A paper describes a structure:
We determined the cryo–electron microscopy structure of Arabidopsis SPT-ORM1 complex, composed of LCB1, LCB2a, SPTssa, and ORM1, in an inhibited state.
During structural determination, a clear lipid-like density was observed in the cytosolic membrane leaflet sandwiched between ORM1 and LCB2a. The ceramide is presumably derived from endogenous ceramide copurifying with the SPT-ORM1 complex. The aliphatic sphingosine and acyl chains of ceramide are coordinated by numerous hydrophobic residues from both ORM1 and LCB2a. The potential acyl-CoA binding pocket in the AtSPT-ORM1 structure is partially shielded by Met14 and Asn15 from ORM1. Our study demonstrates that upon ceramide binding, the N terminus of AtORM1 forms a hybrid β sheet with the N terminus of LCB2a, thus stabilizing the Met14/Asn15 of AtORM1 to limit acyl-CoA binding. The WT SPT-ORM1 complex represents a ceramide-bound state and has a decreased Vmax and an increased Khalf for palmitoyl-CoA compared to the ceramide-binding variant SPT-ORM1 (ORM1-N17A), indicating that the ceramide binding can repress SPT-ORM1 by mixed inhibition.
Numbering used by the authors:
A (entry chain C): 1 to 48
B (entry chain B): 1 to 36, 41 to 475
C (entry chain D): 1 to 156
D (entry chain E): 36 to 62
E (entry chain A): 63 to 480
Write the structure that this text describes.
Amino acid sequence: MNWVQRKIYLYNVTFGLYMLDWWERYLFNSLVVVLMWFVLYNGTRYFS
Amino acid sequence: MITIPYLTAVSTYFSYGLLFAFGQLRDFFRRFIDWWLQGYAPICLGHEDFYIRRLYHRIQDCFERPISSAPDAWFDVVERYSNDNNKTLKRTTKTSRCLNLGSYNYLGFGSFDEYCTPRVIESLKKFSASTCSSRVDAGTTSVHAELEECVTRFVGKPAAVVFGMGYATNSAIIPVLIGKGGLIISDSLNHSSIVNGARGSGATIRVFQHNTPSHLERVLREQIAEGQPRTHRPWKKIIVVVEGIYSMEGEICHLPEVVAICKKYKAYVYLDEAHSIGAIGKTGKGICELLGVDTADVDVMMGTFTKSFGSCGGYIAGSKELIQYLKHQCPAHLYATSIPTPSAQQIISAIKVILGEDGSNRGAQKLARIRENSNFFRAELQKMGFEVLGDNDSPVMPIMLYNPAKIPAFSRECLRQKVAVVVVGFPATPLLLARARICISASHSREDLIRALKVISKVGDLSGIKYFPAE
Amino acid sequence: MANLYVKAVPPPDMNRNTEWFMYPGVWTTYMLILFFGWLVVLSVSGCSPGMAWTVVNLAHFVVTYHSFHWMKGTPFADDQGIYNGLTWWEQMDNGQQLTRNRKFLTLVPVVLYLIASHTTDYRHPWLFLNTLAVMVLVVAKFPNMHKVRIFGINGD
Amino acid sequence: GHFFVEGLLGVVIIILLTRKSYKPPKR
Amino acid sequence: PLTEQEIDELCDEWVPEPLIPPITEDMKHEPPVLESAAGPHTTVNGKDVVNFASANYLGLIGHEKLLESCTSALEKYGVGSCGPRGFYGTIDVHLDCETRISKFLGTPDSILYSYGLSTMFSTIPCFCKKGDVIVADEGVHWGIQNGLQLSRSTIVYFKHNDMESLRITLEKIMTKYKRSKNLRRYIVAEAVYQNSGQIAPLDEIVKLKEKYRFRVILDESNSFGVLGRSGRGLAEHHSVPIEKIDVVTAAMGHALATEGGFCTGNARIIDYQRLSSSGYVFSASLPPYLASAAITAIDVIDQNPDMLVKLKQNVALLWKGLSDIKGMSLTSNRESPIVFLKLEKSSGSAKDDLLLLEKMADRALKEDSLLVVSSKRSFLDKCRLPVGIKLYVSAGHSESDLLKASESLKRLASELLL
Ligand SMILES: CCCCCCCCCCCCC/C=C/[C@@H](O)[C@H](CO)NC(=O)CCCCCCCCCCCCCCCCCCCCCCC
């Protein structure tokens, strides 16, 4: 395992995604990737 | 009592909320799927066992692992498969060879030694296993009358009675001593047998902070002054129940500071030497010898032969007229079947080894070897940054995890590298405190401990369970 | 990456259902879950903050009323069924009223209703709903409405 | 119609943040 | 409020009760210490005596083929279990025993318990909660009536073996709860009663429960391996499918010469008791050598169905000899192997009848070498059935020792009771 492959693994155990099933884990991962793009774009452009 | 890293105590509640929100969505989308048993009522409501199908079924391969060898330092683990969409694990051939770290033989008597097996086997071909009767009918053999004298010499007290179960030694004896109109100040963390034992009578139950005597006295004062709940009558009895070593906390009781408080308020003490009857003490005589406390200060003493002596059973020690009363009124002595003969012959011949009456000198090496291993293993984990509980001498050392998703991650990554451990979850322990239990015996060599340590250190880097600073 | 330790002391309780609420971090997570949801509804479906604070207040009333004032009993068979006729709210704090934890749970739906009204200029299509929530949610957390059922609904 | 509600709840909020915790009644 | 000095007196004027009551002179009598096993012909104080107090019905104590199977599993696993079943206390022999029992009885699944007497404390409280109804039998042994109290539910009793008093109770239960329909109802019985020696009629019990929608829990430890024509149990006796009985528990410390218990039944009820019991998830499992002998003992029962027909002959030969007794009267059944003998015409009081019975059981062994068992009730037992002496006849008893127990029991009651 390289560095990112270990940080992704550490992210899974701390937030409880290691236990969920293949769709449950993909339904929450996809909903967090959309909230990270709506903050970057908006937040760094709607203020400054 | 348990320092919790604040930031790790916020991601634990967020992980349990994700397992609850995703568990209530699959229940409402399954209640509508029952539109596509004969007149009776369901053996359980859907909302009853919610944490047995939405939490325990996700990690069921970390429990009930079958083995096909004696509970030794090394044993064989049977590999199972999921077959039908992960619902019924079925076992195969193709065992493994792991390093036993989740059993209980502290002194290493649960295997095959050159002094007990030969004697136990020779006494089973003369009495033949069980005797099919009670102890007041036909169940008192010569081996049952000689085993009640060995336990009286070991423990120290003037009399003793041995039973066939360690869990029925607390549900069938507390109702005899106290009833309706009495009080039981129990410690918070007591075994379920004690609790069920207090609920078997009409006695009221209270609870004082785990292992702090300054709260026991404040609980006793209120109860003695106040009286019985509704009708303010004075209690007729008070009994205080404590434990020698509190397992899953690895804590040795503050027995001298609990004896002196109960001795002033006229209460009775009830000791529970389940985990500390062959493990701690310079001669294996328990916590009354390690802490140096008079043995006549405690009224009743209960114990168990399952963990140190490698044989099922239990005992109660007390004064000579307490045993005479129990033998005549206890329900586990009048109705239950006597302890099997080869299970009682393995306690006599194990006690004769610890006391050094076997001719050899290998009874003190166990007691010496079990003190080093537990001290060297616990001192090597603290310097690596782990959070291990215990004092200095108890051979139980829980490692805190705090996250429900680190239970399978810690067990499955240790089994892959051939180390076997035990993990405990939320329905059992409190929501925030999940941990792993490590048992160190007197049969592990130093090389085995070194190998196990270099694996536990490597797996704690991935999961990041090194909550403290290293060195 | 680890600091700020707290030696959480163990209380009495003896009820696995409602004893987890005394440990440290239960308030900072109740507010973090309300903020995380707000941002999750403002991004998946582009809206205004006022229309996001109303959906976070309406969804929080359906998830709290069915958990705190509907389901009775405990999901653990360990205690047989001693509390077979007590809603989580009635089990909380062994019957004690107006405690430190009962004051925070009663002051969360009120403060979450003042933010969903002063960010939507009141109006009338949303002021009704946001007024039915608090009314029905605060009335149930009264010290007098203990073990009382309206017209014998869900009480035997 | 916008200040009579925010002005009243602050009064009600102070009322329960000062009450004394008491045991339930007896039989 | 009481001051912290007013409190200090109330803790000084308080004086507690003694831990135990004073020990009397009639509260101490040591039982016999026997040597060389415990079969039909045992040994006490040198002299050879006749055993009638051990509950081995099939005569498997000391069997040649049980010792060879205990030794092999005792030299391989050890004498201890080390740990619970939920951790690392699950050896393969434990799984093979549960597979063999269910194949013997013809049932999907099975479960093992460590102690024989503790298979009813965790089997009753685990099914009934604090809001259900139980209809017990008012003559059930302590083990069963302790699990009835552990499960905080509503217990209603009925007359001993009176199916007329069962219908009356069921009718009144199905009216006092006409509104509720969530309520779970259970009927708790016992195949061959220990305190009376009567055999339950499983013809009306499974016909009355199929009209009121109840559930049955049979505790058949005194019938499993002896009552049926093939040794299946009570079900075979009354010829009823073993599927109508929802739960079937038994103890293996009777006709199996081992220790432990089990609980047979469907798969949805067996696996639910695995993850939510009390004496299964909080106690050490069976030692492997004790569970490796039950497997051997079950095969002996299958391969030899004649040592059952030889048990009926023994009980019918000891029933025809005690048909003359004056002081007492056979109050048991006729096919059950627990010949009871309640004493006709109560001499003294409750504690006076239990002293005259224990003195007659002591003289029987101290004169002509006979071990018999008499009723022993504690203050926790809530049974009110008549007291008496019992004889656990076996299939290994001879014809000479079977007639030597009726002669010394008929001449010992005549010169005492009367
Ligand atoms: C996806 C992120 C969160 C999404 C929703 C998750 C929050 C739901 C928490 C519900 C709390 C349940 C309280 C009592 C429920 C009882 O009924 C049941 C059965 O009786 N007891 C039990 O299950 C035993 C108690 C243990 C339950 C563990 C759940 C606690 C996990 C989080 C606790 C602290 C975080 C939330 C505190 C309360 C939040 C209230 C819900 C917030 C509204 C969300 C809507 C945006």
